Design a protein around this motif. Structure first.
Motif, mmCIF file in Angstrom:
data_model
loop_
_atom_site.group_PDB
_atom_site.id
_atom_site.type_symbol
_atom_site.label_atom_id
_atom_site.label_comp_id
_atom_site.label_asym_id
_atom_site.label_seq_id
_atom_site.Cartn_x
_atom_site.Cartn_y
_atom_site.Cartn_z
ATOM 1 N N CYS A 173 48.870 72.074 2.116
ATOM 2 C CA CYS A 173 49.824 71.163 2.726
ATOM 3 C C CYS A 173 49.167 70.222 3.687
ATOM 4 N N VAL A 226 52.791 80.719 2.248
ATOM 5 C CA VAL A 226 53.175 79.379 2.713
ATOM 6 C C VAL A 226 54.706 79.279 2.898
ATOM 7 N N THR A 271 50.444 69.374 -1.554
ATOM 8 C CA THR A 271 51.713 68.705 -1.237
ATOM 9 C C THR A 271 51.411 67.636 -0.207
#
Ligand SMILES: [Hg+2]
Ligand SMILES: [Hg+2]
Ligand SMILES: [Hg+2]
Ligand SMILES: [Hg+2]
Length: 262
Positions: A126, A194, A56
């Motif tokens: 991330c 997460v 991401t």
């Protein structure tokens, strides 16, 4: 499933893997440095589970300019051989560059912890967009929960860590507590872990807002508090998050894998 027959050097029980660095935490989580892992073994284990990794990135305003190099280098270095779904979160969906992807790799643009991530990927990673991959970043990082050692603080004593020090903040950590100083980017794990992390930080930050206080390093301060109380199952060395202009290239880093862009 069983691994196939494979040919590789025998592990040496009576030879330390590194004499210069700590390669395991006191809760027995690996710390990932070059030399610790055999990548062919790990690729087999993960390919055999048909692993999908989500990556991401937030790219807002001027930061969209960095997407081209970010994606192009992820294509060369990130999880090559595995299924990868990039998720780009942006205010400018039309400014996302058209980057050619390898087979089994896909990109979604989402216009600015959705359940969509559960049905789609096994792991979430991330990171920030203003970076580039310069060397292998692969399945060695994958684990229920990981954070990366901040490149400016890996040799620091806990007293020098820039944790939030005010007791009135949910991110507060005192002087006699703390394992590591994790950078508030490059963390990840299973989708479940997460989402638990981002949910905990988001609730803690709202508590701070209501109390009229904002942690010294914002998101990163709260990440540090979370990973103090919920130990990561792997920790990544600063090979995974470097700034060579600011920090050079010390002997302890055999690879510089993912780095700040000038
Ligand atoms: Hg080793
Ligand atoms: Hg994320
Ligand atoms: Hg947060
Ligand atoms: Hg967080």
């Amino acid at each position: 499933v069983s691994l196939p027959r494979m040919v590789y050097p025998q592990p040496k029980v009576l030879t330390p893997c590194r004499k210069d660095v700590l390669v395991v935490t006191p809760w027995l989580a690996p710390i990932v440095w070059e030399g610790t892992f055999n990548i062919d073994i790990l690729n087999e284990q993960f390919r055999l589970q048909n692993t999908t990794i989500g990556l991401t990135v937030f790219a807002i305003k001027k930061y969209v300019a960095f997407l081209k190099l970010f994606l192009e280098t992820a294509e060369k270095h990130f999880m090559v051989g595995h299924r990868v779904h990039y998720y780009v979160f942006t205010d400018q969906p039309a400014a996302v560059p058209r980057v050619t992807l390898g087979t089994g790799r896909q990109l979604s643009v989402l216009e600015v912890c959705e359940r969509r991530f559960l049905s789609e990927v096994d792991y979430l990673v991330c990171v920030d967009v203003d970076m580039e991959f310069r060397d292998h970043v692969g399945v060695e990082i994958l684990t229920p929960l990981f954070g990366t050692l901040h490149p400016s603080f890996y040799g620091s004593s806990r007293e020098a860590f820039t944790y939030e020090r005010r007791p009135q903040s949910q991110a507060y950590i005192p002087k006699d507590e703390g394992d590591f100083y994790y950078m508030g980017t490059f963390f990840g794990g299973s989708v479940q872990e997460v989402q638990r992390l981002t949910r905990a930080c988001h609730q803690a930050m709202m508590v701070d807002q209501a109390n009229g206080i904002e942690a010294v390093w914002h998101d990163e301060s709260h990440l540090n508090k979370y990973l103090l109380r919920h130990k990561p199952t792997k920790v990544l060395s600063p090979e995974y998050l470097w700034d060579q202009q600011l920090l050079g290239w010390p002997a302890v880093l055999r690879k510089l894998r993912f780095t700040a862009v000038p």
